Amino acid sequence: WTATSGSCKGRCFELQEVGPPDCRCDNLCKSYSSCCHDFDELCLKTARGWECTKDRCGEVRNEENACHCSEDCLSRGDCCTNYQVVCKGESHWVDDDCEEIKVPECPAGFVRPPLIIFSVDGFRASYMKKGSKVMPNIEKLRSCGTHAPYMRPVYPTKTFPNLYTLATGLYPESHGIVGNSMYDPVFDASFHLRGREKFNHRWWGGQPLWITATKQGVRAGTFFWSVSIPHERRILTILQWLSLPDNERPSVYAFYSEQPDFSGHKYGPFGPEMTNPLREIDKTVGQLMDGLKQLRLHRCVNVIFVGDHGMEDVTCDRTEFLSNYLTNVDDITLVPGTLGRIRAKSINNSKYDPKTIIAALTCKKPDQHFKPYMKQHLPKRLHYANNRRIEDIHLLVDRRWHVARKPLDVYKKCFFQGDHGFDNKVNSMQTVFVGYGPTFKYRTKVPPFENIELYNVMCDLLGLKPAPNNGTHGSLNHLLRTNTFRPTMPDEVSRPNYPGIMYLQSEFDLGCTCDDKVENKLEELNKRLHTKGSTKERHLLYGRPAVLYRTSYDILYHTDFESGYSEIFLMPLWTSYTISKQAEVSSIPEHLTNCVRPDVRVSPGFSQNCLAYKNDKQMSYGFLFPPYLSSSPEAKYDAFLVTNMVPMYPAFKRVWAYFQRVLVKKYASERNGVNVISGPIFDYNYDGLRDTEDEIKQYVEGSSIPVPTHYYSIITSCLDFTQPADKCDGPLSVSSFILPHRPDNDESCNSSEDESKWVEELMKMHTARVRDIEHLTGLDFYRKTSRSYSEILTLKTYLHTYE
Ligand SMILES: *[C@@H]1O[C@H](CO)[C@@H](O[C@@H]2O[C@H](CO)[C@@H](O[C@@H]3O[C@H](CO[C@H]4O[C@H](CO[C@H]5O[C@H](CO)[C@@H](O)[C@H](O)[C@@H]5O)[C@@H](O)[C@H](O[C@H]5O[C@H](CO)[C@@H](O)[C@H](O)[C@@H]5O[C@H]5O[C@H](CO)[C@@H](O)[C@H](O)[C@@H]5O)[C@@H]4O)[C@@H](O)[C@H](O[C@H]4O[C@H](CO)[C@@H](O)[C@H](O)[C@@H]4O[C@H]4O[C@H](CO)[C@@H](O)[C@H](O)[C@@H]4O)[C@@H]3O)[C@H](O)[C@H]2NC(C)=O)[C@H](O)[C@H]1NC(C)=O
Ligand SMILES: O=C(/C=C/c1ccc(OC(F)(F)F)cc1)N1CC[C@@H]2CN(C(=O)N3CCc4[nH]ncc4C3)C[C@@H]2CC1
Ligand SMILES: [Ca+2]
Ligand SMILES: [Zn+2]
Ligand SMILES: [Zn+2]
Predict the structure, then answer these.
(1) Which among 23, 25, 505, 555 has the fewest CB atoms less than 10 Å away?
(2) Where on this chain is Cell attachment site (motif)?
């Protein structure tokens, strides 16, 4: 109920919100159907239009007009944005040569530079270059300010997940808006694009920028705009707010445009009809900047121009139908489109089974345009699992395609040529970022980065303390002129032990054998130095990783590698080695095929044993440092120590062996040496975070040896590849993966083929950030470099995309 009998007289776009059942006048009262009777008359004036003409100059104030050209208009804060150009012979912002803003130049009574977020829906990254001819304002912002070639959105590359991620710094799995459409089994309620449940507080988690500002004493405009309010009225409302008195004036604002997403759906990303929406957006930017100039704020305000996701070519005829795969199609509910989420239709049907659903969707058609996953097996870079709103079964859909339940869903609901939502590393899904103003750098290109990182920066732009979020605070300090947040390395929690030789061979009863008994002052003193750390500078290039939790572990030195061995998990947490360009691959000699050797530095009670692997018919083992890369015949025996061994499924061994035998040497050649850090990850509860000892769901049968959910590697070299990995003076270059440790290779449909046709493809899909591995392991890498710490943070957020 709303008693709409109140008035918006002197209340137009009020900032505080008045509670029911009184009538509202804010920029969202339309969407709630709760505006006062006179809202349109008073607050949405349209008369005479949005521009001053020559004949309106010095007119007599007529309050009916959308905006004004009367002499009193500047004091009132309500001129049309081109008033000074027509009536005072001033020039448009876009026509001025751009001059570095070295110091904020703000009017008296402005305590901080204000921030304006200019958000544009569906603004594909390539529009910046391809549309630059018809976007002079946006192109001036871009080239004078700070820009990225693109910004990576979050998955799913939908509007609500991405807009709320921008506002919070959180993965959708954490903020709770995991799609445009959601079912919550605990509330037993659905969230829809169209309807009233989406207004409920309970859906929205974390702490968005406007709330963070408010709680810390920084005033905010209201970010959201009812569709029916024209863009020109949005721009004027923001400029009016900027003219309020100091104690009433907000410091942070947002504009939002439904374009170009809206037209993009109809016409495709580059439909010839897409030029006009792009002109229109640019005209709107021009109005803002012209408007700020009039207020003398154009060298004072920080402006962020930012998109939520891109747009792809997608038609009716590229739809896969689940009814061509499943017999029991009427037993399932599908959330359809550019991603698929499946659950049971009724809670009271016990003949429903996910195992059989996945199976029926798995590599069934030669050309299949989607792949099923249990949510925990999705690539960890997507971070899309740890929410009760994300259904257990997920379909990742190929760019350009749809999934639907039955064909009727598509012709009785072609209309559309564009869509988005796909995997967030797909090129067509990337979006834009440009910062312009006093706190941003001048004429600066920065590398691509992810939208989760912005909340932190926007908080810095405003002097705010960000709420806990998924950004890495400091990783974007290179966008900023000043206002840097200067982070410090986390302290190490566990220090390592350094075991010498403490055990005789006969103390071990591991069921292992090795033919190593075939046997020198000079050369024995020398391998002893190797065990004490003499070649650690070669193999541990950036310091040892810090363990950021309470645990018990040993550092183990060898000729060819170094590891941090956990006495709790009975395996290394990490193993580190360097492979130069000149290094040769050898094979595992005949006599050492089944060789496993006891490590006289580590008690039998802290070791794996071979018998458990003998007995467990599903489980085999593999090695973290690869024997294929041993520097010498004598060094090769080090690679067979029971402390270099890790549990692997025979199907996964296929993937790992190819990686270690072929790919590592390939990267060494291509990058001029590589440093490799490899290890296990235990994430049974799929929260992206290291599991503790009491959370391990699977052990090698009959033993306390835990089975990893994933294996990672981090592969570092010199950004300038004319310098070797082990002798790099400058910035570093990195790529990483987090390979799921699966008992079959069902994920890769061509796996019955040679590893050269499918293994590297699988790794690319599971590319990762060093930061991703950090959360999963509780380790901190790159502790000792010659690089600045902010630069290292940037390196840790880097994702190698292969697009
Ligand atoms: C990305 O970043 C985010 C944020 O940094 C990371 O997510 C955080 O991760 C933490 C660890 O996983 C987690 O700590 C929890 O906190 C539990 C209580 O949290 C509630 O309150 C939160 C704070 O709100 C206030 O925030 C500010 C301060 O900044 C205040 O000033 C305000 O006044 C605010 O009110 C709140 O954010 C949180 O909301 C979540 O849950 C709601 C759903 O009910 C959603 O609305 C919302 O979207 C959040 O939902 C996400 O997170 C939850 C997990 O919390 C998850 O279920 C969802 O899937 C979704 O992803 C809460 O309302 C606290 O209870 C926890 O302590 C338990 O576990 C520990 C384990 O050590 C035990 O010691 C302890 O006993 C306790 O266990 C008890 O309960 C168990 C289960 O019932 C039981 O087994 C046991 O026996 C015990 O009884 C723990 O400390 C943060 O909540 C979380 N924050 C957010 C926003 O998500 C994330 O990890 C990062 N991701 C990556 C990959 O790095
Ligand atoms: O104008 C906006 C958004 C502006 C904006 C600007 C910057 C942002 O990013 C950041 F953080 F970087 F600044 C994020 C958003 N929108 C967003 C899309 C939906 C939201 N909505 C709703 O009806 N609801 C969504 C939210 C909300 N608040 N109160 C009710 C409702 C329901 C209708 C519709 C209006 C237009
Ligand atoms: Ca976990
Ligand atoms: Zn969108
Ligand atoms: Zn859209």
Answers:
(1) 505
(2) 76-78
Give the number of the atom of ligand 2 that is nearest the alpha carbon of residue 167.
11
For residue 746, the CA-to-ligand 5 centroid distance in Å is: 32
For residue 642, give every residue at least 6 positions away whose Cβ sits within 8 Å of its Cβ, in sequence order, or none.
510, 512, 596, 597, 598, 599, 602, 607, 608, 609, 610
Helix (H) or strand (E) holding 332: strand 332-335
Burial class (CB in 10 A: 0-12, 13-18, 19+), 197: middle
Q: Is 265 annotated as a binding residue?
A: yes
**Terminal-residue alpha carbon distance, the chain:** 53
* CATH code of residue 591: 3.40.570.10
- Sign of the alpha-carbon torsion through 149, 155, 158, 164: negative
Burial class of residue 109 (count of CB atoms within 10 Å of its CB; 0-12, 13-18, 19+) = exposed
Q: How many CB atoms lie within 10 A of CB 320?
A: 21
By annotation, the residues acting in catalysis are 159
Alpha-carbon gap, residue 15 to 18, rounded angstroms: 9
Phi, psi of 247 (to 5 degrees): -65, -10
Count CB-CB contacts under 10 A for residue 603. 14
280's CB contacts (< 8 A; 6+ apart) are 231, 259
- For 263, the token pair is 């037209």
Residue 360 host element (H or E)? helix 354-361
| Sign of CA pseudo-dihedral 798, 801, 802, 803 | negative
Pairing state of beta strands 115-121 and 302-307? parallel
Whole-angstrom Cα distance, residue 479 to residue 291? 25
Ligand 1, pocket-test mutation among 155, 160, 165, 174, most atoms within 8 A of CB: 174
**How many Å lie between the centroid of ligand 4 and the Cα of residue 262?**
9
Ligand 2 proximity of 225 Cβ (cutoff 6 Å): yes
Q: What are the start-end ranges of the H helices in 2-72?
A: 39-43
Residue nearest atom 31 in ligand 2 by C-alpha distance: 199
d(CA 151, CA 445): 12
Q: Is residue 180 a known part of a binding site? A: yes
Q: Cβ(231)–Cβ(199) under 8 Å? A: no
Minimal CA–CA distance to 470: which of 386, 537, 411?
A: 386
Quote the CA–CA distance of 453 and 304 in Å, as a whole number: 13
- Extract long-range pairs of 745-751: CB within 8 Å, 24+ residues apart: 745/651, 745/654, 745/655, 746/362, 746/363, 747/371, 747/373, 747/377, 749/363, 749/368, 751/654
Residue 623 and residue 577: Cα distance in Å, rounded?
13
CA-CA distances (angstroms) from residue 444 to 149, 150, 282, 436, 448? 11, 14, 21, 10, 13
Ligand 1 neighbours by CB, cut-off 6 Å: 170-171, 173-176, 205-206, 383, 386-387, 467-470, 687-689, 775
Please tell me the distance between residue 309's alpha carbon and the centre of ligand 4 in angstroms.
6
Collapsed DSSP state (helix, strand, coil) of residue 501 = coil
Provide CB contacts within 8 A for 68, sequence distance 6+. Answer: 59, 61, 62, 76, 78, 79, 80, 83
> Crossing angle, helix 275-294 and helix 136-144, to 10 degrees?
60
The Cα–Cα gap between 495 and 546 comes to 8
d(CA 134, CA 273): 13
C-beta separation of 147 from 434 below 8 A: yes
How many whole angstroms separate alpha carbon 376 and alpha carbon 396?
13
Q: Which domain holds residue 651?
A: 505-797
Tell me how far apart the alpha carbons of residues 211 and 457 are, in angstroms, rounded to a whole number: 16
Q: Quote the DSSP letter at residue 73.
A: H
Ligand 2 mean position, distance from CA 307 (Å): 13
Do the beta carbons of residue 318 and residue 400 sit within 8 Å?
Answer: yes
Q: What are phi and psi of 136, to 5 degrees?
A: -65, -35
Other beta carbons within 10 Å of 546: 19
Nearest CA owner, ligand 1 atom 51: 174
